[PDB]
């Protein structure tokens, strides 16, 4: 099948530039435009250029003509976004796109590159066992700096009784809960444990749960 | 830039009900209008294009129809999966631009919350810190109140709520509150009090621990 897959999160300081990349799979790509989106979580969505990979054609976006610079590589089916001169505007998930039959624009999509532009430092989580039928479970993520921490219990096995909450920014520092909810029989007697992973410092941490 | 007016922003319903869209483009754009689906962490999903062409493999309550400046969407009948925010898009003239989406939300049986409290760690008092986090998980409607009475006394300094995302299962939402504070302002105070105020009870919920039992 078709494939978009865009590379992980950044972060990146203000007046700077940011270079982001979609690997294309499954098709022709010299057949096809790449398209890039912009998402701001109070802005919608907005349609920044496309190139065509080969001749490298491009096209933007009135707004994002000095801002965006399109190229795409043949040799490795990669399709690239730089953005330069960088304000907390252009934090944002930029996702590449795909068009399919005719009138069917935007068909598929990559998942999604989250951006962050700031001069905050980044920091790594801390993370805190929460413990008191069934018995409710927590996880404390405290303290980290940028954007995003992904939280799995048992390594993605107890996804039944979960709940992650979104983060708050507060002095620059981010902090989440995650609670999970299992059978009173089963805990303290089998083990669970919170594993969280934070991709800008490359940081994986994984705490049981005791009582 | 041809400026597209969707209505409206936000939106409540049951499963089985219809609910429908409008969008209003600034100028004609003809029939060039597709219509997109977009779920919590996920890339938007082409439902509709050409006004009124369903795409490969979605489903045949989802309908679109329109002409010139005028368009709306339709889902005949809501499932609980359909919930998502809802984007059109004119594609007739550059740049192409989408509408501010439309959030649908499902309605569902008042549900009252599961409430429980959590002393600070061990490992984090070690670090200076003292977070105490109350859980108040699956209930409905969204709309809840939190009160840390600490000794008695009310606190609305430190206290951080955060909602999760309505499950596509149940139609639940949960919510967390957190109360940070120093080592030594947790070491002053005994009884930690997080009470949920919820329309479903008069009577609020309560939960609470000592600092040492």
Not at chain 2, 139 to 164: A, C, H, M
Request: overall charge neutral.
């Amino acid at each position: 099948e078709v494939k978009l897959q865009q590379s992980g999160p950044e972060l990146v300081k203000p007046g700077a530039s940011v270079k982001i990349s979609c690997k294309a799979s499954g098709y022709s790509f010299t057949s096809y435009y790449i398209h890039w989106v912009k998402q701001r979580p109070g802005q919608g969505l907005e349609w920044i250029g496309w190139v065509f990979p080969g001749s490298g054609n491009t096209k933007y976006n009135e707004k994002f003509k000095g801002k965006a610079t399109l190229t795409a590589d043949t040799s490795s089916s990669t399709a690239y976004m730089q953005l330069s001169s960088l304000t907390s505007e252009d934090s944002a998930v930029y996702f590449c796109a795909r068009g399919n039959y005719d009138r069917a624009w935007f068909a598929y999509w990559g998942q999604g590159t989250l951006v962050t532009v700031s001069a905050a430092k980044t920091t790594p989580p801390s993370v805190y066992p929460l413990a008191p039928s069934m018995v409710t479970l927590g996880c404390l993520v405290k303290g980290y700096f940028p954007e995003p921490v992904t939280v799995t219990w048992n390594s993605g096995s107890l996804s039944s009784g979960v709940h992650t909450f979104p983060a708050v920014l507060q002095s620059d520092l981010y902090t989440l809960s995650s609670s999970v909810t299992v059978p009173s029989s089963t805990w303290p007697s089998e083990t669970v444990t919170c594993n969280v992973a934070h991709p800008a410092s490359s940081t994986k941490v994984d705490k049981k749960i005791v009582p | 830039d041809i400026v597209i007016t969707q209505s409206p922003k936000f939106m409540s319903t049951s499963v089985g009900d219809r609910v429908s869209i409008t969008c209003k483009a600034s100028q004609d754009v003809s029939t060039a209008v597709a219509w997109f689906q977009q779920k919590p962490g996920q890339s938007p999903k082409l439902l509709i294009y050409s006004a009124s062409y369903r795409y490969t493999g979605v489903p045949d309550r989802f309908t679109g129809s329109g002409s010139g400046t005028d368009f709306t969407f339709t889902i005949s009948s809501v499932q609980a999966e359909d919930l998502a925010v809802y984007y059109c898009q004119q594609h007739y003239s550059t740049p192409w631009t989408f509408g501010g989406g439309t959030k649908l939300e499902i309605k569902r049986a008042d549900a009252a919350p599961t409430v429980s409290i959590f002393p600070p760690s061990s490992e984090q008092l070690t670090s200076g810190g003292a977070s105490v986090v109350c859980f108040l998980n699956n209930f409905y409607p969204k709309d809840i109140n939190v009160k840390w009475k600490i000794d008695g006394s009310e606190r609305q300094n430190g206290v951080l709520n955060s909602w999760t995302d309505q499950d596509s299962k149940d139609s639940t939402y949960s919510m967390s509150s957190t109360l940070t504070l120093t080592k030594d302002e947790y070491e002053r105070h005994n009884s930690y009090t997080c009470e949920a105020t919820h329309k479903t009870s008069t009577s609020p919920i309560v939960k609470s621990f000592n600092r040492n039992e």
